[PDB]
From a paper:
Here, we report the crystal structure of the Lit enzyme from [name] and describe its mechanism of action. Conserved residues map to the cap-membrane interface. They include two catalytic histidines that function to effect unimolecular transacylation. The reaction involves acyl transfer from the sn-2 position of the glyceryl moiety to the amino group on the N-terminal cysteine of the substrate via an 8-membered ring intermediate.
The His85Ala and His85Arg mutants were chosen for complex formation since both were essentially inactive with this substrate. His85Ala and His85Arg were crystallised in the presence of the FP2 substrate and structures of both mutant forms were obtained. Our conclusion therefore is that the density observed in the substrate-binding pocket of these two constructs corresponds to structured monoolein molecules. In the His85Ala and His85Arg mutant structures obtained with crystals grown in the presence of the lipopeptide substrate, a different kink appears in M3 that causes it to curve away from M4. Curvature in M3 is such that it separates from M4 toward its extracellular end to a greater extent than seen in wild-type Lit. In so doing, it acts as a gate to create an opening between the two helices that leads into the putative active site. The particular ‘open’ conformations captured in the inactive constructs likely reflect the fact that the catalytic residue, His85, has been mutated to non-conservative residues. Thus, while these mutant forms are not physiologically relevant, the structures they adopt may reveal features, such as the open gate, that are functionally relevant.
Author numbering: -10 to 213
Write the structure that this text describes.
Amino acid sequence: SGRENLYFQGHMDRLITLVVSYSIAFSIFALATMAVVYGKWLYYFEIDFLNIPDLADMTKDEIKRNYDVLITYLSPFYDGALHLPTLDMSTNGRIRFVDVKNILVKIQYVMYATIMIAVIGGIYLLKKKNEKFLLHGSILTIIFPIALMLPIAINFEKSFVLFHKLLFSNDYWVFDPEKDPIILMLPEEFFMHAACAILLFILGGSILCYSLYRYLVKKKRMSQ
Ligand SMILES: CCCCCCCC/C=C\CCCCCCCC(=O)OC[C@H](O)CO
Ligand SMILES: CCCCCCCC/C=C\CCCCCCCC(=O)OC[C@H](O)CO
Ligand SMILES: CCCCCCCC/C=C\CCCCCCCC(=O)OC[C@H](O)CO
Ligand SMILES: CCCCCCCC/C=C\CCCCCCCC(=O)OC[C@H](O)CO
């Protein structure tokens, strides 16, 4: 009965490596996203770099406290509404930031799931002297954030319509600086730089996981 019982098991660890490697890819993507979204140093740098005080007709102290309040609001543990210290906000502006908050709690929710599956299924594979999930995952974390960008290559303007309508509850509403002046201290350059910082953290994440794959496999070879 052994023949038929390892044809099954070999295809099992092959699948488990797949689920674990994809779980590591998303876990690193979500961790990097959370580090940049809730990190303050990048935006604090953009204040002087992009001259946000003159962009928004605000002082630096006002920009930072309004930003600090926004990031506190986007945490999944703050149940209160968004109250900017010195800025007005329209009904559609509050709707937009609840949309932004909702994807973050969605990403974190799935992140906690993938982290557990990656570490639980990962030690099951390490107990079996199998390390390729640290290698398969390593390349998969580089490939995950970019597979989300693939629709851009088919149609640039059109597939940004798809992202916008999957995330946001108001199709047609745009930020009016008179009614939602926080838009003037969130320039487009900050969001692109933030996306680059996410991939930077993702790239660094795959390196350490690849380094772990090679640390494990060299010890495994120096044993046999
Ligand atoms: C040695 C094996 C490691 C096992 C032990 C560590 C396992 C956790 C793994 C990564 C850290 C993830 C921590 C959870 C990140 C919280 C998500 C988050 O930061 O959101 C909260 C808030 O919005 C922002 O301040
Ligand atoms: C997209 C790449 C990921 C970037 C990582 C995020 C880092 C930003 C930090 C906190 C969120 C700030 C609140 C988000 C503000 C959204 C404003 C908006 O809705 O877009 C502008 C609108 O299209 C014009 O009218
Ligand atoms: C290498 C790229 C890595 C991909 C990383 C993508 C992560 C997206 C997931 C959550 C973002 C949550 C915050 C959503 C903020 C979007 C607001 C926005 O994009 O508006 C900017 C606009 O272009 C000017 O105003
Ligand atoms: C079992 C597989 C082990 C694989 C080993 C690779 C682990 C990758 C760890 C970090 C890279 C992601 C970069 C994210 C930078 C730190 C993320 C973080 O934990 O901070 C969250 C933030 O502080 C919330 O407020």
